[PDB]
Amino acid sequence: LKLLDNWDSVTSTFSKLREQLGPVTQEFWDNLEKETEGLRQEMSKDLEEVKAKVQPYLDDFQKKWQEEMELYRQKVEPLRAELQEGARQKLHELQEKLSPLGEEMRDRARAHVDALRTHLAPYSDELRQRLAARLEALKENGGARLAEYHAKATEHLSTLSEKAKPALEDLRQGLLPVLESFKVSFLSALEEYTKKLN
Amino acid sequence: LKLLDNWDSVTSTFSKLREQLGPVTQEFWDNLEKETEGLRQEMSKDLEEVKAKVQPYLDDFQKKWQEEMELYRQKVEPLRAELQEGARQKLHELQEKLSPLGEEMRDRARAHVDALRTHLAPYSDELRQRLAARLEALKENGGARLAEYHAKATEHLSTLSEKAKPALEDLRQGLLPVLESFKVSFLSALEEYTKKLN
Ligand SMILES: CCCCCCCC/C=C\CCCCCCCC(=O)OC[C@H](COP(=O)(O)OCC[N+](C)(C)C)OC(=O)CCCCCCC/C=C\CCCCCCCC
Ligand SMILES: CCCCCCCC/C=C\CCCCCCCC(=O)OC[C@H](COP(=O)(O)OCC[N+](C)(C)C)OC(=O)CCCCCCC/C=C\CCCCCCCC
Ligand SMILES: CCCCCCCC/C=C\CCCCCCCC(=O)OC[C@H](COP(=O)(O)OCC[N+](C)(C)C)OC(=O)CCCCCCC/C=C\CCCCCCCC
Ligand SMILES: CCCCCCCC/C=C\CCCCCCCC(=O)OC[C@H](COP(=O)(O)OCC[N+](C)(C)C)OC(=O)CCCCCCC/C=C\CCCCCCCC
Ligand SMILES: CCCCCCCC/C=C\CCCCCCCC(=O)OC[C@H](COP(=O)(O)OCC[N+](C)(C)C)OC(=O)CCCCCCC/C=C\CCCCCCCC
Ligand SMILES: CCCCCCCC/C=C\CCCCCCCC(=O)OC[C@H](COP(=O)(O)OCC[N+](C)(C)C)OC(=O)CCCCCCC/C=C\CCCCCCCC
Ligand SMILES: CCCCCCCC/C=C\CCCCCCCC(=O)OC[C@H](COP(=O)(O)OCC[N+](C)(C)C)OC(=O)CCCCCCC/C=C\CCCCCCCC
Ligand SMILES: CCCCCCCC/C=C\CCCCCCCC(=O)OC[C@H](COP(=O)(O)OCC[N+](C)(C)C)OC(=O)CCCCCCC/C=C\CCCCCCCC
Ligand SMILES: CCCCCCCC/C=C\CCCCCCCC(=O)OC[C@H](COP(=O)(O)OCC[N+](C)(C)C)OC(=O)CCCCCCC/C=C\CCCCCCCC
Ligand SMILES: CCCCCCCC/C=C\CCCCCCCC(=O)OC[C@H](COP(=O)(O)OC[C@H](N)C(=O)O)OC(=O)CCCCCCC/C=C\CCCCCCCC
Ligand SMILES: CCCCCCCC/C=C\CCCCCCCC(=O)OC[C@H](COP(=O)(O)OC[C@H](N)C(=O)O)OC(=O)CCCCCCC/C=C\CCCCCCCC
């Protein structure tokens, strides 16, 4: 009944709060209408003064922008022309290097790679010998390792049998009384929770 | 009470592990003997070849580095002067723009700033007129609201205390027997818990 009892107190509070909400909304709206009224009168200024002023305000910037664009247009031509001349010369000068020095670089790269290719020829072959040498060792040693690993695995399993059979059996035999004790304790606990919490 | 039994079986499994460790380490060391020597057989011809691999490779690389470095002096060096001259030209080009157009842009800024002096400044003063009215409304409406908030505070405090008295009274009234009831359940719970967790 505690929940329903306190529920009444909440409901009565809500009732009186709702009774207050009326005057509150009335006063709030009444005052809001005043604030909005001031803003309504302000509208004939904040929006109207700026509407009349928006003409010369935008006009000033607009005309200046026109001049700025005109000035930019009168300069964009010679500027682009100079940049064009500069680019032409600078790029032509660059091409004067990208061609001969470029080809020379390619020719040098030929010898660079050719020497590398020539060096890598016996290198790769000797690397094959290295691989074969390592492979032989790793194969012979690997075969021994596999055999050893197998023996180890066998013995590991042999000793694991002691855990799979004796240890497991012994543990299971010890778990049985544990489960029995657990079941009792669980039953007791279940009853406790049902007696005091239900 | 079967902790000793459980530990006993675990001790035996540890003993079996020790029984393994003996031969296992012995053969593992014999394995390592093959692995170390095997790796040494691979590493001997490896390191001995490294001398006859890194040296000639470094030689070829040094020659390549020397060639590349020479090419830098036959490319990067002259191009540095060309790029520097090109930069000097571009700088001149830029200076012949940053100066005249700079003064132009600076004058444009003056035109905009002076405009703002007749745009923002006066508008700010006109804004003061609006702010005066806005703040006036906020002061008037706020003053009325302040009184309303005060009255609402009393109307809220009266209702709060109106509920507080019977609420606290009933709460304490119900808390008394509820606490006693809780004591009974708490006691009976703990008393039985001690019997279960004995
Ligand atoms: C149907 C539904 C029913 C629901 C239940 C209804 C019944 C509820 C039952 C009781 C209600 C009252 C509970 C108790 C209120 C205690 C108020 C209080 O005054 O208690 C103060 C004490 C700390 O005393 P002191 O400082 O003087 O100690 C030191 C003093 N000297 C310095 C001498 C060192 O503290 C405490 O008792 C409380 C423990 C410490 C609190 C530390 C401050 C925690 C603040 C916020 C926690 C926010 C958690 C959630 C965050 C969400 C984030 C998203
Ligand atoms: C439909 C249902 C809607 C919801 C209904 C909710 C009903 C809630 C009913 C009851 C409130 C329950 C929660 C009460 C929480 C505590 C309130 C309080 O009583 O905390 C007072 C403390 C006094 O501190 P002390 O130093 O004396 O002791 C310090 C002691 N120690 C060590 C342990 C910190 O305050 C402090 O500790 C430090 C902070 C003090 C701040 C004071 C600020 C005063 C000015 C402006 C704040 C206005 C906030 C208005 C919030 C809305 C109100 C309607
Ligand atoms: C010192 C203390 C003294 C006493 C103070 C008392 C203050 C009382 C004030 C308000 C009482 C509120 C009572 C609410 C009762 C429960 C209403 C309700 O139905 O709870 C459940 C609903 C629906 O579930 P949910 O959405 O919560 O969860 C959705 C979870 N999902 C995401 C799964 C689906 O909740 C909803 O519908 C969403 C509800 C959102 C409510 C927002 C806050 C409304 C309060 C005021 C509105 C503004 C008033 C002023 C306006 C000024 C304008 C200029
Ligand atoms: C709080 C801290 C961050 C503040 C960030 C903002 C700071 C600046 C102040 C305000 C900026 C507000 C920006 C967001 C505006 C609302 C955007 C929106 O998404 O709103 C959605 C809602 C709900 O509908 P929806 O989501 O589907 O919106 C699209 C469909 N739709 C037509 C029917 C609304 O929209 C609605 O509820 C109804 C919307 C009706 C809008 C009427 C606009 C009339 C235009 C001018 C009126 C006269 C102005 C005179 C000068 C006044 C100067 C102060
Ligand atoms: C200490 C070792 C046990 C000692 C007692 C038992 C000894 C038993 C006999 C010999 C011991 C052998 C130990 C090594 C066994 C390696 C087995 C193995 O095959 O290895 C490789 C596998 C690889 O994956 P896969 O088998 O799926 O094959 C691939 C499957 N395909 C195709 C999806 C992706 O490994 C895996 O699988 C996942 C392996 C995850 C192992 C987690 C071990 C966590 C143990 C301790 C953590 C904390 C260490 C630090 C403690 C500090 C205390 C102060
Ligand atoms: C001392 C100790 C012992 C020795 C240790 C070192 C041993 C080294 C032995 C071998 C290392 C081999 C490394 C490379 C392996 C992959 C070889 C390969 O199969 O490569 C194929 C590419 C195919 O190109 P593609 O024109 O047919 O495809 C054109 C595709 N589409 C249509 C976009 C443009 O061959 C190409 O790209 C080449 C043409 C493109 C070149 C791009 C720039 C390369 C930068 C510098 C030159 C480096 C030269 C030396 C090798 C550097 C390898 C990073
Ligand atoms: C023996 C050792 C000799 C070393 C010689 C070094 C200097 C070599 C000079 C010239 C010849 C070698 C040039 C090597 C670099 C360019 C290689 C190249 O031809 O690449 C071509 C690719 C083409 O891509 P795509 O757009 O056609 O396809 C995009 C879409 N997809 C992925 C799927 C294809 O990429 C591109 O063309 C974009 C290339 C952008 C420029 C890259 C320049 C890289 C060169 C040096 C950078 C070094 C940085 C060092 C930082 C650490 C310093 C301590
Ligand atoms: C690709 C190959 C290109 C080769 C040619 C490259 C040419 C350009 C290379 C370098 C030019 C300088 C780059 C910046 C170096 C900053 C160094 C530094 O350590 O500077 C610290 C100052 C500390 O100032 P403070 O107030 O503590 O002390 C009072 C002022 N003090 C420092 C000088 C006593 O830092 C400050 O002053 C912060 C304010 C700095 C204002 C600088 C205004 C310069 C004039 C116009 C602005 C231009 C902006 C361009 C933006 C990028 C456009 C693409
Ligand atoms: C409908 C409701 C109407 C108004 C009801 C007012 C009474 C409310 C009644 C009970 C409590 C309401 C809820 C109060 C919540 C308090 C939370 C709090 O915990 O507050 C204290 C903590 C202290 O933090 P601290 O000491 O570690 O740091 C201090 C940093 N430092 C020095 C800037 C001082 O504040 C902080 O944590 C950081 C934030 C501190 C904010 C302080 C704001 C002070 C502003 C005005 C004070 C007005 C006092 C008179 C009010 C009369 C109302 C009628
Ligand atoms: C960590 C990664 C950094 C990446 C940087 C990328 C941009 C590099 C920019 C320009 C090119 C490099 C320009 C390097 C200019 C170096 C100028 C210079 O004096 O550097 C001095 C440092 C000294 O290091 P220390 O550790 O000895 O001392 C540090 C000192 N105490 C401190 O307070 O830090 O050593 C160094 O900084 C580097 C020493 C290099 C030695 C070999 C120099 C060899 C010279 C040329 C190389 C030719 C290669 C040709 C072949 C190319 C491939 C084909
Ligand atoms: C009347 C009860 C009726 C039944 C009730 C059943 C439900 C009970 C549920 C809750 C009630 C208890 C609620 C207890 C709440 C405890 C809250 C608490 O104290 O938090 C702090 C403690 C602090 O421990 P400590 O001081 O050791 O650690 C300090 C820390 N190292 C440091 O640097 O300062 O944290 C710890 O102690 C954690 C480690 C503890 C180690 C020792 C743990 C010791 C545990 C048992 C002791 C041995 C029992 C042997 C068997 C007895 C029965 C046969």
CSV table of N, CA, C and O in Angstrom, one decimal, chain A residues 58-94:
chain,number,residue,atom,x,y,z
A,58,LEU,N,24.2,48.3,-49.1
A,58,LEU,CA,24.6,47.3,-50.1
A,58,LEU,C,25.1,48.0,-51.4
A,58,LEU,O,26.0,47.6,-52.0
A,59,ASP,N,24.5,49.2,-51.7
A,59,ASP,CA,24.9,50.0,-52.8
A,59,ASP,C,26.4,50.4,-52.7
A,59,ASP,O,27.1,50.3,-53.7
A,60,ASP,N,26.8,50.8,-51.6
A,60,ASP,CA,28.2,51.2,-51.3
A,60,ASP,C,29.1,50.1,-51.6
A,60,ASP,O,30.0,50.2,-52.5
A,61,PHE,N,28.9,48.9,-51.0
A,61,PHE,CA,29.7,47.7,-51.2
A,61,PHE,C,29.6,47.2,-52.6
A,61,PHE,O,30.6,46.8,-53.2
A,62,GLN,N,28.4,47.3,-53.2
A,62,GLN,CA,28.1,46.8,-54.5
A,62,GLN,C,28.9,47.6,-55.6
A,62,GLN,O,29.6,47.0,-56.4
A,63,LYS,N,28.8,48.9,-55.5
A,63,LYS,CA,29.5,49.8,-56.4
A,63,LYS,C,31.0,49.6,-56.2
A,63,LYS,O,31.8,49.5,-57.2
A,64,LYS,N,31.5,49.5,-55.0
A,64,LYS,CA,32.9,49.3,-54.7
A,64,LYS,C,33.4,48.0,-55.3
A,64,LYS,O,34.5,47.9,-55.8
A,65,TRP,N,32.5,47.0,-55.1
A,65,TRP,CA,32.8,45.7,-55.6
A,65,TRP,C,32.9,45.7,-57.1
A,65,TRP,O,33.7,45.0,-57.7
A,66,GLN,N,32.0,46.5,-57.7
A,66,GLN,CA,32.1,46.7,-59.2
A,66,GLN,C,33.4,47.2,-59.6
A,66,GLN,O,34.1,46.7,-60.5
A,67,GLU,N,33.9,48.2,-58.9
A,67,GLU,CA,35.1,48.9,-59.1
A,67,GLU,C,36.3,47.8,-58.9
A,67,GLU,O,37.2,47.7,-59.7
A,68,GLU,N,36.2,47.1,-57.8
A,68,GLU,CA,37.2,46.1,-57.4
A,68,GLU,C,37.2,45.0,-58.5
A,68,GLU,O,38.3,44.6,-58.9
A,69,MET,N,36.1,44.6,-59.0
A,69,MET,CA,36.0,43.6,-60.1
A,69,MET,C,36.6,44.2,-61.4
A,69,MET,O,37.3,43.5,-62.1
A,70,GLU,N,36.3,45.5,-61.6
A,70,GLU,CA,36.8,46.2,-62.8
A,70,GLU,C,38.3,46.3,-62.7
A,70,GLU,O,39.1,46.0,-63.7
A,71,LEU,N,38.8,46.7,-61.5
A,71,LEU,CA,40.3,46.8,-61.3
A,71,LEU,C,40.9,45.4,-61.5
A,71,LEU,O,42.0,45.3,-62.1
A,72,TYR,N,40.3,44.4,-60.9
A,72,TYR,CA,40.8,43.0,-61.1
A,72,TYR,C,40.8,42.6,-62.5
A,72,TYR,O,41.8,42.0,-62.9
A,73,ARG,N,39.8,42.9,-63.3
A,73,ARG,CA,39.7,42.6,-64.7
A,73,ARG,C,40.7,43.3,-65.5
A,73,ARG,O,41.3,42.7,-66.4
A,74,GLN,N,41.0,44.5,-65.1
A,74,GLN,CA,42.0,45.3,-65.8
A,74,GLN,C,43.4,44.8,-65.5
A,74,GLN,O,44.4,45.2,-66.2
A,75,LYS,N,43.6,44.1,-64.4
A,75,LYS,CA,44.9,43.6,-64.0
A,75,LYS,C,45.0,42.1,-64.3
A,75,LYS,O,46.1,41.6,-64.6
A,76,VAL,N,43.9,41.3,-64.3
A,76,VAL,CA,43.9,39.9,-64.6
A,76,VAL,C,44.5,39.6,-65.9
A,76,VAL,O,45.0,38.6,-66.2
A,77,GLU,N,44.3,40.6,-66.9
A,77,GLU,CA,44.8,40.4,-68.2
A,77,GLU,C,46.4,40.5,-68.2
A,77,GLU,O,47.0,39.5,-68.6
A,78,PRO,N,47.0,41.6,-67.9
A,78,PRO,CA,48.4,41.8,-67.8
A,78,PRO,C,49.1,40.7,-66.9
A,78,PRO,O,50.1,40.2,-67.2
A,79,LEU,N,48.4,40.5,-65.7
A,79,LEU,CA,49.0,39.5,-64.8
A,79,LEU,C,49.1,38.1,-65.4
A,79,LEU,O,50.1,37.5,-65.3
A,80,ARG,N,48.0,37.7,-66.0
A,80,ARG,CA,48.0,36.4,-66.7
A,80,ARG,C,48.9,36.4,-67.8
A,80,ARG,O,49.6,35.3,-68.1
A,81,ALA,N,49.1,37.5,-68.5
A,81,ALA,CA,50.0,37.6,-69.6
A,81,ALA,C,51.4,37.5,-69.2
A,81,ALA,O,52.2,36.7,-69.7
A,82,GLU,N,51.8,38.2,-68.1
A,82,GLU,CA,53.1,38.1,-67.5
A,82,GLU,C,53.4,36.7,-67.0
A,82,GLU,O,54.5,36.1,-67.2
A,83,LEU,N,52.4,36.1,-66.3
A,83,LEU,CA,52.5,34.8,-65.8
A,83,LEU,C,52.7,33.8,-66.9
A,83,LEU,O,53.4,32.8,-66.8
A,84,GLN,N,52.0,34.1,-68.0
A,84,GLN,CA,52.1,33.3,-69.2
A,84,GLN,C,53.5,33.3,-69.8
A,84,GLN,O,54.1,32.3,-70.1
A,85,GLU,N,54.0,34.5,-69.9
A,85,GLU,CA,55.4,34.7,-70.4
A,85,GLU,C,56.4,34.0,-69.5
A,85,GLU,O,57.3,33.2,-70.0
A,86,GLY,N,56.2,34.2,-68.2
A,86,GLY,CA,57.1,33.6,-67.2
A,86,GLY,C,57.0,32.1,-67.3
A,86,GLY,O,58.0,31.4,-67.3
A,87,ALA,N,55.8,31.6,-67.3
A,87,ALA,CA,55.6,30.1,-67.4
A,87,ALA,C,56.2,29.6,-68.7
A,87,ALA,O,56.9,28.6,-68.6
A,88,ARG,N,56.0,30.3,-69.8
A,88,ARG,CA,56.6,29.8,-71.1
A,88,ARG,C,58.1,29.7,-71.0
A,88,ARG,O,58.6,28.6,-71.3
A,89,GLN,N,58.7,30.8,-70.5
A,89,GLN,CA,60.2,30.8,-70.4
A,89,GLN,C,60.7,29.7,-69.4
A,89,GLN,O,61.5,28.9,-69.7
A,90,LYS,N,60.1,29.8,-68.2
A,90,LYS,CA,60.5,28.9,-67.1
A,90,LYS,C,60.3,27.4,-67.5
A,90,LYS,O,61.1,26.6,-67.2
A,91,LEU,N,59.2,27.1,-68.1
A,91,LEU,CA,58.9,25.7,-68.5
A,91,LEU,C,59.8,25.3,-69.7
A,91,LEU,O,60.2,24.2,-69.8
A,92,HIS,N,60.0,26.2,-70.6
A,92,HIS,CA,60.9,26.0,-71.8
A,92,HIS,C,62.3,25.7,-71.3
A,92,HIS,O,62.9,24.8,-71.8
A,93,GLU,N,62.7,26.4,-70.3
A,93,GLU,CA,64.0,26.3,-69.7
A,93,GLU,C,64.1,24.9,-69.0
A,93,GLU,O,65.1,24.2,-69.0
A,94,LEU,N,63.0,24.5,-68.3
A,94,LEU,CA,62.9,23.3,-67.6
A,94,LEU,C,62.9,22.1,-68.7
A,94,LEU,O,63.6,21.1,-68.4
